[PDB]
């Protein structure tokens, strides 16, 4: 017989024999993230090691089958992934310390408490507190203390761990036919099988910059408008020509500017698009948020959540009795078991993420028919983009009025749309420079172009230039501020969030063609449109089988990320921001700092 | 004409795996099919070739009832002329099937916690199963051109184990399947209806 068939009957033995292992890792992994115990860290790691051992043993057996003989391309992808030498190229000396460092940096981030300088026994932790302080407080000193203490008491202790994290990871990628660890992540977007739809590791880094350049004019007029409205909330604390203090931004890191809406809302007297206050007054419990999110996907034809979802998902905080990893997570455990773990509070920012995370589940549920190795998003951005297409539609005032969170007599207006668009731009437009800078810092660190003595200098040298954000307090190289975010302590490719955004408006425009839509790219609730849902269902069911360039093209018509739909969505705001910055400065001075 | 013991095979404590299904002859008794209609727990009660309502009015010389446990989405493979892993390697129904296929959920029984790996199924077989065939073979599966004396790179154990867990989704949940066929011969009606 042929060697391709000899390899088909190898993947078949793999797929059926692998699921109960991955699931077993999953169940234990779920039982730790929802229940923090020393008993369950061991159980999670044992099933992770046995799963890893199954990978190593069934990866070596996969090498014997040569790819060049295989012609069925979908078979080639699955063999290609299973033949990849992962941490196996690392010796027992390297792989242990790498895993030990990765666990240690996650636990420091997980167990990161900051003691009040007065009454040291009072300790605030980043998740329950130290995030309300960094999202609601208008005290510059209180924000300065929550931002600096977190990036010094917690950040500095990660500096030695991150330094050896880079070199041990770089030894892995360079061994496994890459240039650095950054290329390993960049290989997610590579297609090298189909002419015309091909892609390269570097083509991403050029497309991102080429598409980020056309975002910069929009970002500047968002930056200038926010700066002028933050100068009122924090008088004598923000330079009208200079950059923005980091702690005064929406969250702990400046990743999202959503919370600044309260300080930057253009027309306050119009009914609030931020329906967070509306939900609490209507006793919207966490179940309703996901139930209302569920009805949204049902309205477009996508399935109900499985019975195992509601029974086995964790939607609230379990309480003080048992701890939990309350970072929002969607789980494709396998075996038809789909769960969402999230510390859902009664807020619009959690209502939208419930749509976002359920978007992952709808993506996860759709490509479950695909073989195990093809059970994944078309790229990293596709998974995040899919959930955002819903929260893009669900955040519209028409949809909010449809679910009872906005007045039944709510009338749209020129002013309300600006309120809605600006709030969206704070979350979407505001995060693009943050994501582009953060990865470009990590990418150059992995390439080595940023030496170890010029790490923190170059982190804020770019944060002032690219993002227009300044350090409130000078930071030694002893600090490790990049790692203060989750996606860097827990080693996740972060460029997925920049690519996500350009996809999400590319998708929504096409989905708002399949749904017969009159007006602009906003006011585009695809809710109740089965044509919009099924057009996405076709893309979701493919998963990784067809190339993401082809998968995107079949949906929107472009083989690459297009920034034009994003700008057309925000064009009523971009024109309005410029007219609100005639008597204001657009841009930022790199040289100004709040400590000079 | 004592009632046909349909309860023994359906309500049985333990159901066999798919690669070795359990066949029980039913004869020398008047069959009450109306008790089968009433049971609402049957998620997939679909007779093929004969309507259930006229089953009580017709008589057969023999009644074969096959019992086994498949996965949730593999129940569709227990159907005429279907293709897949179970239908081609485990239990194939004739394309001209004249009978019934009944299945219900067995999480409460077959599935527990941890993993109920007790149930097995055939993953590889050289030939496709001829209809109403059972392969109990534990002999390996030589996918390659190298002789098979031990489970190795291309020698695979043909049987694999279902992982049945209460957290699994409907597709991966254990379903007990009973298949009632019929067999008309030149013999008296050993299985009849209550009217006759
Ligand atoms: C959390 O895990 C411990 C052991 O790791 C277990 O005894 C306890 O029952 C679990 N909590 C819940 C609520 O299941
Ligand atoms: C590759 O093999 C699978 C086996 O299930 C088949 O479904 C698929 O159509 C094949 N691809 C091509 C291009 O023939
Ligand atoms: C994996 O490592 C083996 C040696 O252990 C080597 O022969 C093989 O080419 C490697 N595979 C890849 C894809 O680098
Ligand atoms: C979705 O779930 C609701 C809640 O029970 C149910 O009434 C409805 O029939 C379901 N619809 C679909 C399409 O699953
Ligand atoms: C979708 O249809 C339902 C059924 O009448 C309706 O109640 C709901 O308002 C519709 N959704 C929108 C966004 O109009
Ligand atoms: C199984 O037992 C119950 C009562 O124990 C009975 O009502 C039911 O008819 C039985 N099922 C069959 C198929 O005989
Ligand atoms: Zn997400």
Short mmCIF file of C-alpha atoms in Angstrom, two decimals, chain A residues 43 128 187 217 234 243 253 312 345 373 426 566 579 596:
data_model
loop_
_atom_site.label_atom_id
_atom_site.label_comp_id
_atom_site.label_asym_id
_atom_site.label_seq_id
_atom_site.Cartn_x
_atom_site.Cartn_y
_atom_site.Cartn_z
CA UNK A 43 -3.47 16.28 39.03
CA UNK A 128 -10.54 41.76 43.00
CA UNK A 187 4.39 31.05 11.96
CA UNK A 217 -4.25 59.39 12.12
CA UNK A 234 -6.80 65.40 36.24
CA UNK A 243 1.95 62.14 26.29
CA UNK A 253 -1.72 48.77 31.53
CA UNK A 312 -20.47 22.54 33.89
CA UNK A 345 -19.87 40.78 36.97
CA UNK A 373 -5.50 18.49 14.83
CA UNK A 426 -11.77 53.58 23.19
CA UNK A 566 -12.37 49.53 10.43
CA UNK A 579 -13.66 69.07 14.41
CA UNK A 596 10.89 66.03 35.16
#
